Amino acid sequence: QVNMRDMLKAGVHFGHQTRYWNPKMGKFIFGARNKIHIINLEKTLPMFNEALTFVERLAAGKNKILFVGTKRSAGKIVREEAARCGMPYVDHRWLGGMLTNYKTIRQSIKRLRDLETQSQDGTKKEALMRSRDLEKLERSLGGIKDMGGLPDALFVIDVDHERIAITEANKLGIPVIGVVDTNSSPEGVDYVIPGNDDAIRAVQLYLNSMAEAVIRGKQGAATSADEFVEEAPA
Amino acid sequence: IRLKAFDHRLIDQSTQEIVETAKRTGAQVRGPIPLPTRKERFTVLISPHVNKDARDQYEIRTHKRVLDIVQPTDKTVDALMKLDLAAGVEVQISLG
Amino acid sequence: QKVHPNGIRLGIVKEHTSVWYADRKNYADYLFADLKVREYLQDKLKSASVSRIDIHRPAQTARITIHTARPGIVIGKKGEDVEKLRQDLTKQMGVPVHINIEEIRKPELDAMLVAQSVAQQLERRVMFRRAMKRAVQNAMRIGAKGIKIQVSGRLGGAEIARTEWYREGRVPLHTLRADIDYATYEAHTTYGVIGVKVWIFKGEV
Amino acid sequence: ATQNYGTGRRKTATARVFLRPGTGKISINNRGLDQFFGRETARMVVRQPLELTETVEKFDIFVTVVGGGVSGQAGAIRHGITRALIEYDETLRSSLRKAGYVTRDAREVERKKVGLRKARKRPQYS
RNA sequence: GCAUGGCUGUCGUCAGCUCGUGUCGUGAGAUGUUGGGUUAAGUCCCGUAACGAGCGCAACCCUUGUCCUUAGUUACCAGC
Numbered sequence: 164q165v166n167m168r169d170m171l172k173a174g175v176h177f178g179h180q181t182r183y184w185n186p187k188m189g190k191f192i193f194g195a196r197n198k199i200h201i202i203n204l205e206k207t208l209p210m211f212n213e214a215l216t217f218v219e220r221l222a223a224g225k226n227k228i229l230f231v232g233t234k235r236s237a238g239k240i241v242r243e244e245a246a247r248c249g250m251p252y253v254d255h256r257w258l259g260g261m262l263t264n265y266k267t268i269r270q271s272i273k274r275l276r277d278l279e280t281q282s283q284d285g286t287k288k289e290a291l292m293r294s295r296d297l298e299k300l301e302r303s304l305g306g307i308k309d310m311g312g313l314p315d316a317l318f319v320i321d322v323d324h325e326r327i328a329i330t331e332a333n334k335l336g337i338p339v340i341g342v343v344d345t346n347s348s349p350e351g352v353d354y355v356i357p358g359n360d361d362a363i364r365a366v367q368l369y370l371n372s373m374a375e376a377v378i379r380g381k382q383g384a385a386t387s388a389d390e391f392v393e394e395a396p397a
Numbered sequence: 398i399r400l401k402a403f404d405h406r407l408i409d410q411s412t413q414e415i416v417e418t419a420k421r422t423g424a425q426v427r428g429p430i431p432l433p434t435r436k437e438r439f440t441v442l443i444s445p446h447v448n449k450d451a452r453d454q455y456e457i458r459t460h461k462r463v464l465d466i467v468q469p470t471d472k473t474v475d476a477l478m479k480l481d482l483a484a485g486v487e488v489q490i491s492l493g
Numbered sequence: 494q495k496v497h498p499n500g501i502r503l504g505i506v507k508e509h510t511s512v513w514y515a516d517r518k519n520y521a522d523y524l525f526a527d528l529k530v531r532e533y534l535q536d537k538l539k540s541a542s543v544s545r546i547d548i549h550r551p552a553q554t555a556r557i558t559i560h561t562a563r564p565g566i567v568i569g570k571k572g573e574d575v576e577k578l579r580q581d582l583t584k585q586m587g588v589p590v591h592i593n594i595e596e597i598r599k600p601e602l603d604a605m606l607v608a609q610s611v612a613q614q615l616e617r618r619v620m621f622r623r624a625m626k627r628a629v630q631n632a633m634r635i636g637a638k639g640i641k642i643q644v645s646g647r648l649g650g651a652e653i654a655r656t657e658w659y660r661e662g663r664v665p666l667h668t669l670r671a672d673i674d675y676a677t678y679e680a681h682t683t684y685g686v687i688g689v690k691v692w693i694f695k696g697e698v
Numbered sequence: 699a700t701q702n703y704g705t706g707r708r709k710t711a712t713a714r715v716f717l718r719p720g721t722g723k724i725s726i727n728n729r730g731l732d733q734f735f736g737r738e739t740a741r742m743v744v745r746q747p748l749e750l751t752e753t754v755e756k757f758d759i760f761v762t763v764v765g766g767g768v769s770g771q772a773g774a775i776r777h778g779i780t781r782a783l784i785e786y787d788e789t790l791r792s793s794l795r796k797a798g799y800v801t802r803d804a805r806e807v808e809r810k811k812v813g814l815r816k817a818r819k820r821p822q823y824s
Numbered sequence: 825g826c827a828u829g830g831c832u833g834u835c836g837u838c839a840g841c842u843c844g845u846g847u848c849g850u851g852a853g854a855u856g857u858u859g860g861g862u863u864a865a866g867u868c869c870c871g872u873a874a875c876g877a878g879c880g881c882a883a884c885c886c887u888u889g890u891c892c893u894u895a896g897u898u899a900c901c902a903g904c
């Protein structure tokens with residue numbers, strides 16, 4: 164969490180290289196040891212703690228938090244520490260136009276709400292002609308079972324990989340919780356996390372903080388769900 | 398008995414309207430026998446002013462169907478002929 | 494080009510409008526009756542819209558089922574037209590004639606009834622498209638799954654033969670399993686002749 | 699009993715072939731085999747499935763064939779007797795599936811199409 | 825027949841032709857519909873600022889080739 168040896172042992176400090184580089188990020192750098200850039204260690208955790216402050220500020224306010232960043236290599240922690248009743252997530256490539264073309268996706272979730280139940284029956288290959296399409300819809304639309312509204316918290320684990328969702332977020336005005344690296348640019352993201360995406364430990368120790376802060380947000384929402392009707396502790 | 402109509406969704410669906418409604422009244426009537434089918438092709442030209450190799454060809458059918466009694470003792474089907482004629486079935490009687 | 498959508502499905506979808514067996518010596522003496530009946534009846538029933546006129550021949554006389562969506566105009570004060578025509582259909586068709594009248598509830602889902610209204614609107618000097626954008630959505634609030642309407646002809650212009658084409662929904666035409674209506678009624682304006690085609694697609698199988 | 703019924707069709711022919719134990723009695727439509735098929739090579743082609751299965755001397759053969767052409771009836775018998783030989787067992791099944799005798803030849807004549815003159819020949823243009 | 829409806833030829837039974845919403849472009853546009861593999865086929869698979877839908881292709885129809893059931897006169901002759 165806030166502990167320093169969580170930052171030291173996970174592999175946060177190291178960057179990509181010295182030629183893969185961006186001087187709009189270079190304020191938040193510490194050195195260039197052995198031709199690999201070393202990120203700053205002391206400005207991270209004040210920024211990192213205040214990111215979880217506004218996660219918990221939203222999480223007790225009856226809204227949604229969206230987890231993205233689908234890489235097949237190290238995105239399985241996003242597959243794992245999610246999929247509960249307050250946070251949607253994604254599993255495949257981010258579709259071009261989702262927040263802005265949400266009227267179409269409302270029509271394409273109509274197929275999703277049937278083909279699970281439609282496999283009750285199961286001719287012979289004709290059952291396989293429709294049970295094949297259930298795999299692709301599970302691969303992309305499976306993580307979103309929510310319908311209605313727009314997610315009030317986009318948590319991007321990798322900014323350099325997905326400029327698609329950041330553009331479609333700022334067209335609508337929703338907060339973006341990005342995790343930038345050395346090479347990626349700190350523009351478009353709202354609450355920055357100057358961290359690293361080059362280890363399974365660092366991608367896990369960024370996300371144990373996030374799914375815990377919404378449980379306490381739900382524990383805070385369960386603390387406050389009596390405040391909605393009763394006024395004596397409210 | 399012999400039957401003539403234009404489509405097999407009448408004439409082979411009115412034999413059961415006769416076989417059931419005569420064997421009920423005691424007399425024995427055997428299974429109906431098909432006959433060969435009339436087939437007449439009509440190749441007509443299709444363009445108003447001439448272009449010869451564009452054509453269209455039709456065909457008119459006529460289904461036949463023959464019943465066979467064993468013991469004639471029922472005038473029941475003689476009254477039930479307006480029932481057994483429905484739209485396009487013609488029945489010439491051969492009460493064997 | 495686009496062989497007629499009844500002539501490919503006589504069989505798997507629809508049936509004939511007239512069923513009667515005839516010998517080879519009287520086959521061409523019942524057709525000439527039944528073809529100048531339909532030219533007679535539609536010229537009399539220009540109003541009280543008529544879609545289908547079926548003719549059966551039972552034993553030795555006749556039967557006719559005229560379909561209207563407004564039967565009260567034809568049966569007016571208990572058959573003042575019914576017995577009047579039944580006297581005078583025998584004068585063209587020497588057998589005694591039956592006349593039977595049903596209803597065409599949902600009149601905006603049969604193609605002849607729709608396309609007669611198009612000739613009425615386009616001879617009242619109504620706009621060629623404001624008449625037809627409203628004549629498809631009205632036939633899509635209730636019923637069909639696809640409608641095409643082609644309007645071809647002079648269309649008001651000087652030397653202009655344009656074709657309006659508007660479509661909604663789904664209309665197949667190379668599926669014999671489906672069920673398609675079709676009708677071509679024309680229009681005589683103060684200049685030119687406008688022909689209208691309608692392809693109301695009801696449910697399949 | 700031992701009477702065996704065999705049918706076979708090739709090029710709009712149809713042959714009733716009866717097969718029962720006997721001594722070389724080959725008779726077709728109350729005619730001898732050399733007398734019926736006048737001067738052709740198919741006088742031996744009707745024996746080709748018979749001498750393959752080494753039963754040329756051990757059966758009576760009674761054949762009644764209708765329709766077809768001259769050398770189309772001879773093919774009907776050859777297909778016809780192979781169905782009659784396999785009423786016994788499937789010992790000679792593999793001796794005839796490999797021989798290419800059991801499959802009915804599907805190659806039938808093709809209809810005249812409009813514009814064309816034959817089934818596929820069309821007139822000359824320039 | 826250059827005032828037009830109706831009906832037919834033609835490219836060509838060739839595999840294409842368009843729309844909705846979205847984003848890029850000052851705009852005419854474009855993207856979907858491109859890439860890799862494959863197919864008689866814009867037929868499929870993997871990819872991917874596009875996600876879908878229609879017309880088409882395929883199948884649905886007819887006929888010919890195998891067998892089964894129902895049927896035996898005017899058709900049929902193995903047994904008598």
Ligand SMILES: [Mg+2]
Nearest residue numbers: 840841857866
């Ligand atoms: Mg194209």
